[PDB]
Design an enzyme around this catalytic site. Structure first.
Site, PDB file in Angstrom:
ATOM      1  N   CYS A 169       2.328  56.381  21.195  1.00  0.00           N
ATOM      2  CA  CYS A 169       1.590  57.557  20.779  1.00  0.00           C
ATOM      3  C   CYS A 169       2.527  58.180  19.758  1.00  0.00           C
ATOM      4  CB  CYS A 169       1.329  58.530  21.923  1.00  0.00           C
ATOM      5  SG  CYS A 169       0.383  59.974  21.354  1.00  0.00           S
ATOM      6  N   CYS A 197       2.357  62.130  19.687  1.00  0.00           N
ATOM      7  CA  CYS A 197       2.833  62.965  20.797  1.00  0.00           C
ATOM      8  C   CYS A 197       3.414  62.175  21.980  1.00  0.00           C
ATOM      9  CB  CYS A 197       1.738  63.899  21.324  1.00  0.00           C
ATOM     10  SG  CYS A 197       0.079  63.229  21.604  1.00  0.00           S
ATOM     11  N   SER A 198       2.581  61.821  22.959  1.00  0.00           N
ATOM     12  CA  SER A 198       3.082  61.118  24.150  1.00  0.00           C
ATOM     13  C   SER A 198       1.993  60.488  25.019  1.00  0.00           C
ATOM     14  CB  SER A 198       3.872  62.110  25.003  1.00  0.00           C
ATOM     15  OG  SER A 198       3.101  63.278  25.235  1.00  0.00           O
ATOM     16  N   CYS A 199       0.785  60.419  24.469  1.00  0.00           N
ATOM     17  CA  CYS A 199      -0.397  59.871  25.125  1.00  0.00           C
ATOM     18  C   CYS A 199      -0.067  58.590  25.892  1.00  0.00           C
ATOM     19  CB  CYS A 199      -1.476  59.633  24.084  1.00  0.00           C
ATOM     20  SG  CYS A 199      -1.726  61.218  23.239  1.00  0.00           S
TER      21      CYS A 199
HETATM   22 CO   LIG Z   1       0.499  61.607  22.936  1.00  0.00          CO
END
Ligand SMILES: [Co+2]
Ligand SMILES: [Co+2]
Lengths: 228, 203, 228, 203
Positions: free
Chosen positions: B107, B110-112
């Site tokens: 991701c 972000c951090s998905c």
């Molecule tokens: Co993310």
């Protein structure tokens, strides 16, 4: 927005810091930060897209080196102030109070079964973003498309590394909440979603891996037809 | 990386702790956050939801060709057959590693991550180093950071989760595991093998 | 490299901090940092292009918020270590020594008239990067060209915001030191230089100013012909 | 901008001072840096080279059409007529502001600036805020930061110094200055007017 957070393709960030193992939560404050996600969501502070936008607006230097969950705290404060639900001056006063008295108690409060109900429902039932729309999909598998060069100053899921690049539609997933409207407080305004394949050479030029491709999801307005 | 402008980790933690407790006190007074709600969320991701769930899906696909077809056709619906799904995994798309292709997820924005099958992502996955480099130098990153050498002739497909679609890697079944039980096979499936940064455990 | 330092077009960096007035040097260390530029140049630590590359390799968070001249110090140390002229361990030891004894004297040394001569010559005579080459210019005024999508991991003057964009050649300036080779210790390898005009709409899409253009300098290998 | 991870300005200055003095001691021992070399460089840019030099060029162009033509044709050679030139101004290209066009200069990649005519750049010019925004929202930046409103119909040309070519703005001569001496006109030429962030002083 063209924020620093959009790191795909950025050079010079350094080696990966990866301990052999780690706990889910490294400190008690992290558990609190994490739990505030469904709490502020239910309270109307923001939706998922707005949540992301709040983090994207962080001071880049702070974003790049702060503990992950601190990003979440920043977005809660951002939206709390935006919606008028959080008074910044009172927050600052309380911060100093807890700095000087870290073991001071939290405010007296009653537990609420509804909040536990929400947690269980959100966790196991999910918060699906898929929506139904009246218009049929503009694109289909095999279509060669080009990613938009638009550069909205508000929230969007347009990574700088894919803008203006040509790829092939891999799959149509149906319609979903549109970030460009949702993340900016403009509503769901659902759009069809597609996974598009971009070769590494297309993305990075000669420096790209000769045998690699990146799959990136694009909402309908993000792409235009090149070859059907 | 060294930054002469940065405070010590100790001072940073002390400051964050105070700011979080302050914000917490306000949300508590507003009636939208409680201690039980905090404990419940933490309990779920510390003991209930984790990579052992994704491993169950992987071993079923490894030992059931029909389920594997369903898993690759519709990840969300297939995982529901095992009572697996929910928050941040509402839309899952599983990708199969083969002798010709290797998949890796990220991701960049972000951090998905697919929480229902892998639980919360490890910190490195959420950090700028991995996110920035994997879409640009996936082969070098896998070798240098994970000691995983993917031959130049083998294609590496990097999946960037820019939407709510969550990508999960179905690693290849390690050789020498003919006839193993689902429980025995599960010992070979790691969180890393489902992210694509490492293959499933050998032997 | 795709470093964070390449800020043209980046959103969220904040308002400009601009005092009504300020001194040329805000502290004595700044004068030292500044003077080390011609000193390390003369000593062979690096050329101008390498100087820039050293700064581009800085920790992004440190780069974004550190005093300007600190960037210069970082590049001196970078190249001092690269060339083996600076022993890092000794530098660290001396740093601690001066932390504990800030008023301790600097090493005894003789003044050198040659160093003053160099300063006067460099300041008033300049360090021209213009060079003569045997090949004639490939492009000319009026030519419509497209900027390369190459993404070298080493030094280059290829701002991410102009890559893959189409513009018009405004002027051919002759040949100059080529950054892609010079900044990476590969020599001058001069290339013809051109100023190219890019419309704001071309660079930013619909969000661009409808009546603005950006002029960016491109070395010959950076651009390819579209329309003569 | 606030960064909870950042040390105080005082601590930052103390650390930098020590690191610089340490590096200085080593370069001094190597025989490549001396106290006189440091003092000479500082003296030049504190009292000798500054925006008053660029102002001399501007007023000559304002009062001599032929020199103006030469200045716009070859900035380096024209400035040499006034004994102006040197370090970081080896290649200068002057751009003329008109009723139809406004020019503004920047170095998005670092801090490139025409030292021979303007001296060392002010800190804001070298910082990320100005550099990042001027090529993207020049009209809004000029109004918000410098109180300079450029009509939507007037084109703004932003010059990014990616090469050794140094761009300098020749501001328009303010109205009501007919017959003024070069000395009187010089009082209206500012460093800001030659960067393009402000027009020359009115009245
Ligand atoms: Co993310
Ligand atoms: Co510069």
């Amino acid at each position: 927005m063209n924020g620093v957070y959009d790191v795909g393709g950025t050079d010079g960030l350094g080696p990966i810091n990866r301990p052999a193992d780690e706990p889910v939560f490294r400190a008690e404050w992290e558990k609190v930060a994490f739990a505030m996600f469904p709490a502020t969501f239910r309270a109307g502070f923001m939706g998922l897209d707005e949540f992301r936008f709040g983090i994207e607006q962080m001071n880049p230097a702070e974003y790049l080196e702060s503990p992950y969950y601190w990003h979440w705290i920043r977005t809660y404060i951002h939206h709390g102030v935006r919606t008028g639900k959080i008074d910044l001056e009172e927050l600052e006063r309380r911060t100093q109070y807890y700095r000087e008295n870290p073991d001071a108690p939290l405010p007296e409060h009653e537990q609420k079964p509804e909040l536990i109900e929400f947690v269980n429902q959100a966790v196991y039932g999910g918060l699906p973003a898929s929506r139904e729309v009246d218009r049929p999909p503009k694109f289909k598998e095999g279509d060669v498309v080009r990613f938009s060069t638009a550069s909205p100053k508000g929230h969007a899921r347009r990574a700088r590394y894919v803008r203006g690049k040509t790829g092939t539609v891999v799959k149509h997933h149906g319609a979903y909440i549109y970030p460009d409207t949702a993340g900016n407080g403009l509503g769901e305004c659902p759009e069809h979603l597609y996974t598009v394949r971009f070769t590494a050479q297309e993305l990075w030029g000669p420096e790209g891996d000769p045998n690699s491709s990146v799959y990136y999801d694009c909402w309908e307005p993000y792409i235009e037809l090149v070859d059907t | 990386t060294e930054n002469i402008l940065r405070k010590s980790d100790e001072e940073i933690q002390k400051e964050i702790t105070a700011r979080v407790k302050a914000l917490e006190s306000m949300l508590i007074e507003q009636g939208i956050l409680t201690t039980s709600m905090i404990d419940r969320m933490a309990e779920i991701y510390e003991n209930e939801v984790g990579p052992h769930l994704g491993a169950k899906v992987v071993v079923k696909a490894w030992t059931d060709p029909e389920f594997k077809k369903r898993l690759l056709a519709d990840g969300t619906e297939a995982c529901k057959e095992l009572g697996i799904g929910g928050l941040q995994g509402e839309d899952m798309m599983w990708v199969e590693n083969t002798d010709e292709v290797h998949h890796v997820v990220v991701c960049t924005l972000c951090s998905c991550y697919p929480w229902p099958v892998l639980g919360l992502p490890p910190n490195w996955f959420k950090e700028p180093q991995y996110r920035s480099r994997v879409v640009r130098e996936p082969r070098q990153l896998l070798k240098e950071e994970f000691g995983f050498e993917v031959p130049p002739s083998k294609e590496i497909k990097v999946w960037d989760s820019s939407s709510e679609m969550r990508f999960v890697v179905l690693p290849q079944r390690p050789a020498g595991t003919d006839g193993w039980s689902e429980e025995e096979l599960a010992t070979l499936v790691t969180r890393e093998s489902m992210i694509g940064v490492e293959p499933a455990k050998a032997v």
